Design a binder for this molecule. Structure first.
Ligand code: NDP
Ligand code: ZN
Lengths: 146, 206, 125, 95, 294, 86, 134, 114
């Protein structure tokens, strides 16, 4: 039901700040030249990027390539993941390694610091399915949510 | 039963017997013979047998299919040989009809049947125009229905309904010009098929 | 008499399609997903080929949806993915194939609704 | 219920009207914007509620086969009327 | 951009170019090419016309349904000008007459009318204004047509300072009064092709750098008037008016290097040798190129 | 100008990646101990030829095939990449 | 501000919590002057004189395979290994737990409906929030 | 992989038919320009003929080449016999089409298509 948010508050035109200090519509050529000029005058730590929650991988790599070409490596995400130890070196460090379907094969599930009902609602549905049909034992560490 | 079409077993039996008759006489070319539930006899042949099979049906004393009612093609893209070539023949002597079918692809030519029936001349030109099937030894093969210089074969299943170009008069060049097609209202595709099976008798093995 | 042709079957030059609608298009070869609104499965039997969606805009006069994509409505049907792929290749279309999704066999038991000691016991009928 | 916008253009029953900066209203210059003045929403709101003595009432829209498909309307709720889904006529149970 | 003038489509007949253009003087020679190019790409064209609607019929096929809109106007009535331009993003002035009439002299058609359109357009908030002047416009010319052009070019520049002013040499084409003028019969000429002039106008609408500039549209080559007229007869196989018209024909085409030309707008000037046959074929009764001044 | 990132690609089953798998199982922990701030992105994907990618300053990248290498040939290949500053 | 596309307006790759790569398809094109997100960056890199080496969606997907091959294996769950090595490096540097109890950001249904720009813009989600909180 | 031919058994005989077709088209251009009173040159017409032939230079299948020659001969018959009109001949040149952008940036500014 959130698809109707795609019809409101949409960005439809490039914008830049004018002399009054307000965003105003401009062309693609004007907007990108403004950005391209600034990108050519900075290097290294002077340039950084943050990726939001709904960004696709094609845009993620394109942006990483562009900032690398100014010798920048500050490609960041909003969500945190500890970089201690292996960090993002090994994929198994940050994946649901059992897989969603593997929940139906488990016999004990321990939940730590998550309300999966509202974080991964279909994943929680899978847990209840095993709870119901496999007599799965579920334990939780965290707030006692429904 | 007032609303159901009545069957005709006498005609079904007669056509089945004649279908075997043809298969026995031309085993070199006949691949399949079937009679539909509404009594139409279909002879499916290898495309090499077009001229021999048609000549036999026209000229044999027990056939005498002197009239080519129609000749057309069907495009079925899922087949290796996408084009089905259909001949519908009429025998006045025996007051009967028969259908001869064969097949070809985009690159394999079919022998022109103008020697058997002069009616085939324009029918084969239309097939070439609409489906792009080439007929060998045709007295004058060329487009017949499409505009001169028209590119593509419109009746192929993968040719778009509205085509690729549209015409208008341009005042700057003082003539009719062709340009890529843009439509003020796009044709609205409808998904009409019911997800529930209608005819169990035609169910295919899973 | 026959001849040997060892070439890959390519008919792009004799189909009359404009070049832009061969090189720049991405065909999708797939079995359609069951419409979740209904239980019938008869629309999930055949393989379908469709092309990438392109721009539709509002007609200034009426507001109708206009297009310049000639293949916007072209959907082809195939008995197998192999037939679909063969058709795509000879026509020069780059394509993506999606494997057929089949519902897995389920274990159903009306009696489990009344289990003596299992959570499958239903609380209502 | 034809209301007019600040620029003088009539608002249709579907709520349509070109805004101030919309070039498309040039089409009406020297001509007119066709608007139907009989707003069906205002006209159906004038009909009175029909008082009936049953929990269920039917509406075919009037005129028999000249109306709409015949539907049956439940009147159990006493905090609102039963409205025909086809023609908008309203019903209420007596007492 | 207002949402209705954001371009959509592939630049064809049913596309939306985002241009809403009022073209004054659209029913003449240059007008039909300008309206054609605007309608080719799906622009909203407003055509104010003084003439019978019958004389506007050739413009109707030039645009998809609804895109060509016709209005009555009078050059002396500012209310009619305002009606035509107040919804537009660009106003194009192509009004003119090669001769004077009892109701409209050159001062009315090349000074008063252009000034009225420029002022009303300015008041109505129109952002772009394209005014056609003349290459040989000169306050001290011997031709009153060219004297009025220079006065009007000045009035438009002060009234609409952001206006784009375009100064074409004599334009040749199927419906011109240049090659046809000779065919129906000291000085150097640099004639320019009709379609090049149109392409220049269209590119000026889309070019933001064109605002406030003055352009001169000239052909690739310069010819001696005698040699040019000789060439026209050879092409037509023809064996080799007003006094004011003769003055302009005998005015040498000015060289103005300080103004941008067709090249600055992306238009490649078309030689007269490639297009004379197209214009002059109708004059044959069923060729060595002219010497070019370098 | 020097190194910015290392990426190692390999299969989970294929014998051609056996040397790479051994290297990771036995040498990666020590390698990461000596280079705590160097990203060593290990990315397994079935039926790929093992490869080593080194990304240098200003987006310069090189790749060296590790197919059929041994745990030592892998060790040298990392050693060459760490020593070189392309 | 550079207007990009939404997930309904591009064919783009997303990796789910299992590490499974999946791609969207274009249902409608982006509104107004908005453009595909990777194309905005590719265009910017050309104007800045540092042109990226991909010109098509397939090419920028060949780039993705060069960085992490599993990003182009659509619908496949590529197993990840070496949990033992990650655990060893985890034990290297101890850190302290804070006494604060683990509390999820979403405690009741009202926190569920609005969590990103699209849902925050949704009038339907606003009705759902109003319904459960009142 | 054994197929029935159209006219040519191999590329060598297919290429012979291609050259004969090109000679016929090359020699026909001067008549076409005059007969249809076209406003292009003979050089322009012969350049177009080369352009049309060259775009198919990559075909290695004698059956595809045979069909291309068949269609090219059909197109020539229409021109020689004046079944085409001026509009049909002049369609090869697209003189009312604005040149579509080619580079990435130009295509990026105008819309979403590749
Ligand atoms: N063509 C050339 O050789 C050159 C032309 N120019 C300028 O280009 C513009 C057009 O050229 P061209 O198209 O050849 O001129 P045309 O005479 O061919 O077209 C004249 C236009 O002006 C309109 N017009 C004339 N007088 C009036 C008036 N009193 N009130 C309202 N409308 C009027 C006409 O409308 P109607 O049809 O109703 O009379 C017509 O639409 C003119 O400004 C001309 O001076 C400049 C340099 C060279
Ligand atoms: Zn009713």
């Amino acid at each position: 039901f959130a698809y109707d948010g795609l019809k409101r508050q949409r960005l439809t035109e490039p914008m830049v700040r004018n002399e009054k200090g307000l965003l105003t519509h401009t062309t693609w050529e004007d907007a990108l030249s403004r950005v391209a000029g600034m990108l050519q005058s900075f290097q290294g730590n002077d340039v950084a990027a943050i990726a939001g929650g709904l960004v696709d991988a094609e845009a993620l790599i394109a942006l990483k390539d562009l900032l690398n070409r100014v010798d920048s490596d500050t490609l960041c995400t909003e969500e945190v993941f500890p970089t201690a130890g292996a960090g993002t070196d090994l994929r198994s460090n940050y994946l649901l390694n059992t897989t969603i379907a593997g929940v139906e094969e488990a016999d004990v599930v321990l939940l730590v610091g998550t309300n999966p009902r509202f974080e991964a609602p279909l994943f929680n549905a899978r847990i209840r399915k095993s709870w119901l049909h496999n007599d799965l034992k579920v334990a939780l560490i965290g707030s006692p949510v429904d | 039963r007032p609303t159901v079409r009545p069957r005709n077993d006498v005609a079904h039996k007669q056509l089945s017997a004649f279908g075997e008759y043809v298969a026995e006489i031309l085993p070199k070319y006949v691949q399949q013979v079937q009679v539909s539930c509404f009594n139409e006899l279909e002879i499916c042949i290898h495309p090499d047998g077009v001229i021999p099979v048609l000549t036999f049906l026209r000229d044999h004393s027990n056939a005498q299919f002197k009239s080519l009612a129609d000749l057309t093609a069907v495009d079925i893209p899922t087949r290796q040989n996408r084009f089905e070539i259909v001949y519908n023949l009429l025998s006045l002597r025996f007051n009967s009809r028969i259908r001869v079918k064969t097949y070809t692809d985009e690159l394999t030519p079919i022998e022109s049947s103008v020697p058997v029936y002069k009616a085939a001349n324009w029918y084969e030109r239309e097939i070439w125009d609409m489906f792009g099937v080439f007929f060998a030894n045709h007295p004058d093969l060329r487009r017949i229905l499409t505009d001169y210089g028209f590119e593509g074969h419109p009746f192929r299943k993968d040719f778009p309904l509205s085509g690729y170009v549209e015409l208008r008069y341009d005042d700057e060049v003082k003539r009719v010009v062709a340009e890529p097609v843009e439509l003020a209202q796009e044709f609205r595709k409808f998904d009409l098929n019911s997800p529930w099976e209608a005819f169990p008798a035609y169910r295919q093995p899973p | 008499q026959l001849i040997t042709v060892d070439e890959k079957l390519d008919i792009t030059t004799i189909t009359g399609v404009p070049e832009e609608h061969i090189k720049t298009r991405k065909a999708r070869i797939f079995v359609p997903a069951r419409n979740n609104m209904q239980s019938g499965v008869n629309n999930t039997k055949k393989w379908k080929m469709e092309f990438d969606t392109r721009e539709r805009w509002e007609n200034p006069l009426m507001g109708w949806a206009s297009t310049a994509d000639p293949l916007s409505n072209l959907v082809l049907t195939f008995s197998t993915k192999e037939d679909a792929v063969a058709f795509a290749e000879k026509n020069g279309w780059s394509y993506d194939v999606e494997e057929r999704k089949v519902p897995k066999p389920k274990s159903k038991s009306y009696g489990a609704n009344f289990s003596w000691n299992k959570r499958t016991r239903v609380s209502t009928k | 219920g034809v209301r007019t916008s600040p620029t003088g253009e009539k608002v249709t029953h579907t709520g349509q009207v070109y805004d101030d900066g919309d070039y498309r209203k040039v089409r009406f210059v020297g001509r007119q914007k066709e608007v139907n003045e009989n707003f069906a929403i205002d006209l159906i709101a004038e009909q009175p509620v029909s008082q009936v003595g049953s929990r269920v009432i039917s509406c075919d829209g009037g005129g028999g086969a000249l109306g709409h498909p015949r539907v049956y309307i439940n009147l159990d709720k006493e905090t609102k009327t039963g409205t025909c889904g086809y023609c908008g006529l309203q019903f209420r149970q007596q007492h | 951009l207002h949402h209705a003038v954001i371009p959509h489509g592939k630049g064809g007949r049913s596309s939306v170019s985002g241009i809403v253009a009022t073209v004054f003087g659209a029913t003449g020679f240059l007008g039909r090419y300008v309206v054609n190019h605007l309608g080719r790409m799906g622009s909203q064209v407003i055509v104010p016309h003084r003439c019978e609607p019958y004389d506007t019929m050739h413009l109707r096929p030039m645009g998809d349904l609804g895109q060509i809109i016709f209005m009555d106007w009078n050059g002396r009535d500012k209310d009619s000008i305002r009606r035509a331009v107040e919804h537009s993003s660009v106003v194009i002035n192509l009004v003119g007459r090669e001769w004077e009439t009892q109701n409209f002299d050159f001062e009315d058609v090349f000074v008063k009318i252009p000034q009225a359109i420029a002022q009303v357009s300015k008041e109505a908030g129109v952002e772009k204004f394209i005014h056609i002047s003349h290459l040989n416009a000169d306050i001290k010319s011997s031709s009153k047509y060219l004297r009025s052009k220079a006065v009007g070019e000045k009035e438009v520049r002060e009234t609409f300072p952001e206006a784009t002013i375009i100064k074409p040499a004599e334009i040749f084409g199927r419906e011109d009064r240049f090659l046809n003028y000779f065919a129906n019969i000291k000085t150097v000429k640099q004639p320019v092709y009709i379609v090049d002039v149109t392409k220049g106008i269209i590119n000026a609408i889309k070019d933001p750098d064109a605002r406030g500039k003055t352009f001169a549209f000239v052909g690739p080559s310069r010819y001696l008037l005698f040699d040019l007229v000789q060439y026209v007869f050879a092409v037509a196989h023809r064996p080799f008016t007003t006094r004011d018209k003769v003055e302009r024909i005998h005015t040498t085409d000015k060289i103005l290097p300080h103004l941008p030309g067709l090249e600055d707008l992306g238009v490649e000037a078309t030689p007269l040798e490639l297009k004379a046959i197209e214009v002059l074929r109708r004059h044959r009764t069923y060729v060595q190129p002219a010497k070019t001044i370098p | 100008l020097g190194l910015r990132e290392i990426r190692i690609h390999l299969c989970q089953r294929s014998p051609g990646s056996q040397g790479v798998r051994d290297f990771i199982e036995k040498r990666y922990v020590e390698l990461k101990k000596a280079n705590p701030d160097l990203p060593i992105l290990i990315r397994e994907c079935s039926d790929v030829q093992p490869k080593l990618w080194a990304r240098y300053a200003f987006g310069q990248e090189k790749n060296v095939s590790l197919n059929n290498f041994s745990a030592d040939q892998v060790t040298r290949a990392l050693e060459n990449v760490l020593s070189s500053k392309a | 501000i550079l207007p990009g596309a939404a997930y309904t307006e591009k064919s783009a790759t997303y990796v789910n919590t299992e590490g499974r790569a999946q791609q969207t398809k274009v249902a409608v094109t982006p509104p107004g002057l908005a453009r595909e997100d990777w194309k905005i960056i590719r265009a910017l890199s050309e104007i800045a004189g540092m042109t990226l080496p991909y010109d098509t969606l397939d090419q920028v997907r060949n780039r993705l395979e060069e960085v992490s091959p599993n990003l182009v294996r659509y619908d496949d769950v590529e197993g990840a290994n070496y949990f033992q090595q990650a655990s060893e490096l985890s034990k290297l540097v101890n850190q302290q737990l804070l006494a604060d109890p683990l509390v999820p950001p979403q405690l009741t249904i009202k926190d569920f409906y609005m969590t990103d720009s699209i849902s925050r813009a949704s009038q339907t989600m606003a009705k759902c929030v109003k319904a459960v909180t009142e | 992989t054994s197929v029935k031919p159209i006219f040519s058994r191999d590329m060598n005989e297919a290429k012979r038919r291609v050259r004969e077709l090109y000679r016929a088209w090359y020699r026909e251009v001067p008549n076409t320009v005059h007969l249809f009173q076209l406003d292009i040159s003979v050089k322009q017409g012969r350049d177009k003929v080369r352009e049309m032939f060259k775009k198919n230079a990559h075909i290695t299948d004698p059956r595809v080449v045979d069909l291309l020659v068949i269609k090219g001969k059909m197109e020539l018959e229409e021109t020689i016999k004046v079944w085409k009109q001026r509009t049909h001949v002049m369609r090869f040149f697209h003189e009312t089409e604005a040149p579509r952008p080619k580079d990435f940036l130009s295509k990026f500014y105008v819309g979403h298509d590749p």
